[PDB]
């Protein structure tokens, strides 16, 4: 009906920055290495708490509140892990060779071995993080990307009165406008702007890929009855199966 469509680029950034969730701590109590069951419990606990914050963060994403409850639910069920992943990668940027799950929980690929098959996803997360650092990704750019994920990943799976999927593309289009605005500000030529824009949107494909692979491993988790997943995670997880 309105809202986000009347936002200047600068205003877009402001709202997105101001909406950022906090960096959570883990219950990570060092002393002794401890097992895959513990590491998974730590990560699960952390992820579950992050989801709660992500959910209230989405409400603050321009245009999201314009959506029907069912459509908000769909977008998040599709995008949650992608959003957690890009967040993890972003906060891990200046920690080459390590993932910063929490300020008190920094891990290298060797510690990822603790969990079967988690190493594969670990390496891809590191590779994404190295990419961002190579590109010198900016905070203002990161928040745009994260919102793009939220709006984009669930759209092509939405019919008579769709035509409000057009509202989502309208918003996505303004976020694109914002990205360009930012880049032109940093001294880039048009050619440079379009190239960087492409480079950033291409990374999203890889994040989609990481999420898919991650989901498969998560589902695996539950059925293995290894470490009990949170009710919220089980809910989200069942969305990518039925």
């Amino acid at each position: 009906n309105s809202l986000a469509l009347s936002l200047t680029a600068d205003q877009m950034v402001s709202a997105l920055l101001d909406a950022e969730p906090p960096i959570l701590y883990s219950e990570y109590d060092p002393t002794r290495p401890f097992s895959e069951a513990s590491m998974m419990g730590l990560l699960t606990n952390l992820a579950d708490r992050e989801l709660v914050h992500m959910i209230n963060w989405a409400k603050r994403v321009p245009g999201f509140v314009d959506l029907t409850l069912h459509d908000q639910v769909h977008l998040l069920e599709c995008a949650w892990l992608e959003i957690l992943m890009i967040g993890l990668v972003w906060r891990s940027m200046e920690h080459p060779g390590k993932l910063l799950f929490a300020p008190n929980l920094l891990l290298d690929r060797n510690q990822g071995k603790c969990v079967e098959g988690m190493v594969e996803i670990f390496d891809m997360l590191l590779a994404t993080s190295s990419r961002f650092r190579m590109m010198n990704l900016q905070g203002e750019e990161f928040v745009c990307l994260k919102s793009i994920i939220l709006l984009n990943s669930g759209v092509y799976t939405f019919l008579k009165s769709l035509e409000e999927k057009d509202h989502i593309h309208r918003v996505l289009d303004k976020i694109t406008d914002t990205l360009i605005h930012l880049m032109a500000k940093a001294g880039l030529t048009l050619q440079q702007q379009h190239q960087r824009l492409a480079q950033l949107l291409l990374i999203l494909s890889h994040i989609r890929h990481m999420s898919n692979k991650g989901m498969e491993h998560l589902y695996s988790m539950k059925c293995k009855n290894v470490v009990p997943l949170s009710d919220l995670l089980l809910e989200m997880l069942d969305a990518h199966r039925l």
Binding site: I55, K59, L69, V73, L76, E77, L232, E235
Partner: peptide
Amino acid sequence: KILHRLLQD
């Protein structure tokens, strides 16, 4: 549906 609930709020 929790997400539903959390969102509703």
